[PDB]
Specification:
The protein is of the alpha+beta class. The chain folds into two domains: 1-66, no CATH class; 67-262, no CATH class. It has helices at residues 34-45, 72-78, 83-102, 153-156, 164-179, 189-199, 212-221, 232-235, 251-261, and strands at 15-19, 26-30, 55-58, 62-65, 105-106, 115-117, 123-125, 132-133. A hairpin with a 6-residue loop joins strand 1 and strand 2. The radius of gyration is 18 Å and the shape is globular. The N and C termini lie far apart (40 Å). Bound molecules: the ligand O=C1N=c2ccc3ncsc3c2=C1CNc1ccc(S(=O)(=O)Nc2ccccn2)cc1. The active site is at 109 (proton acceptor). The modification Phosphotyrosine is found at residue 16. This is Serine/threonine-protein kinase PAK 1. Belongs to the protein kinase superfamily. STE Ser/Thr protein kinase family. STE20 subfamily. The modification Phosphothreonine is found at residue 143.
């Protein structure tokens, strides 16, 4: 409990900004279910990585690092991304996922909403409120947690699921970067859950627009066979990531996004 211790929209609490007095760093400060809070700070403090929004301190308040580029959601809903930019974002997210999975942590809520962007093009992950710390003795989980449209079918059907569900969600995020929305978004969340259960691997509106390499990456991200689905370390070696652009190539997207949402 106590043991470990304005850009605000209502959200699930509010957000503000500030500056470091001594070093000058700019920081962002977040201001129902406290047990999840305990899990969240514990997981955040011991899992620092360049591709994760780093947790600074706590006081309920939470101080974490500053990224002024916004979230990937504004980019995917207001801009058109090309395969190079998508590959760069996917590589950053896969690096974060490899780091977490090597530490036996499953995010379970990967989506464009939980990706933050720096003005330099930095791609980072956040929102650990839905973590799953697994172990050799208990390495699977059946709780139906996450956001419906991004949830893997094995999670939806409450089967035994592992870290690769994150991979599935990453694939859904890739569809976001292609079409602007995850599959079934016009449907309500419950019908969306049923459609994920009954259809399986989602179909793209216009797959013809994609290179065979990108289709291959998606097919290895959205494979129903968990053994056949790729791990983060396996996917980091995919040829798709070879056509990745420099992160500095996301700065225009960010610039476009802020123009669109103003
Ligand atoms: O840098 C950040 N680290 C964060 C960690 C968690 C978190 N949770 C919600 S936001 C956030 C974090 C940020 C930055 N968040 C952010 C929010 C809005 C914008 S913005 O493009 O919309 N600019 C602004 C600025 C003031 C008021 C409203 N919007 C930019 C970054």
């Amino acid at each position: 409990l106590r043991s470990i211790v304005k850009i605000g929209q209502g959200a699930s609490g509010t957000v503000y900004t500030a500056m470091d007095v001594a070093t000058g760093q700019e920081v962002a400060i977040k201001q129902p279910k406290k047990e999840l809070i305990i899990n969240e700070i514990l997981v955040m403090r011991e899992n620092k990585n360049p591709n994760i929004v780093n947790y600074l301190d706590s006081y309920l308040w939470v101080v974490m690092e500053y990224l002024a580029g916004g979230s990937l959601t504004d980019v995917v809903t207001e801009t058109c991304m090309d395969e190079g930019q998508i590959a760069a974002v996917c590589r950053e997210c896969l690096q974060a996922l490899e780091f977490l999975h090597s530490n036996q942590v499953i995010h379970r809520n990967i989506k464009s909403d939980n990706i933050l962007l720096g003005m330099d093009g930095s791609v980072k992950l956040t929102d650990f409120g839905f973590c799953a710390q697994i172990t050799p003795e208990q390495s699977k989980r059946s709780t139906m947690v996450g956001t419906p449209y991004w949830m893997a079918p094995e999670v939806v059907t409450r089967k035994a699921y592992g870290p690769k569900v994150d991979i599935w969600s990453l694939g859904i995020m890739a569809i976001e970067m292609i079409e602007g929305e995850p599959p079934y978004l016009n449907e309500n969340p419950l019908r969306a859950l049923y459609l994920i259960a009954t259809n399986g691997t989602p179909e793209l509106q216009n797959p013809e627009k994609l290179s065979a390499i990108f289709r291959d990456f998606l097919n290895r991200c959205l494979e129903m066979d968990v053994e056949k689905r790729g791990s983060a370390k396996e996917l980091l070696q995919h040829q798709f990531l070879k056509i990745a652009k420099p992160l500095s190539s996301l700065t225009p997207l960010i610039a476009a996004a802020k123009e669109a949402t103003k």
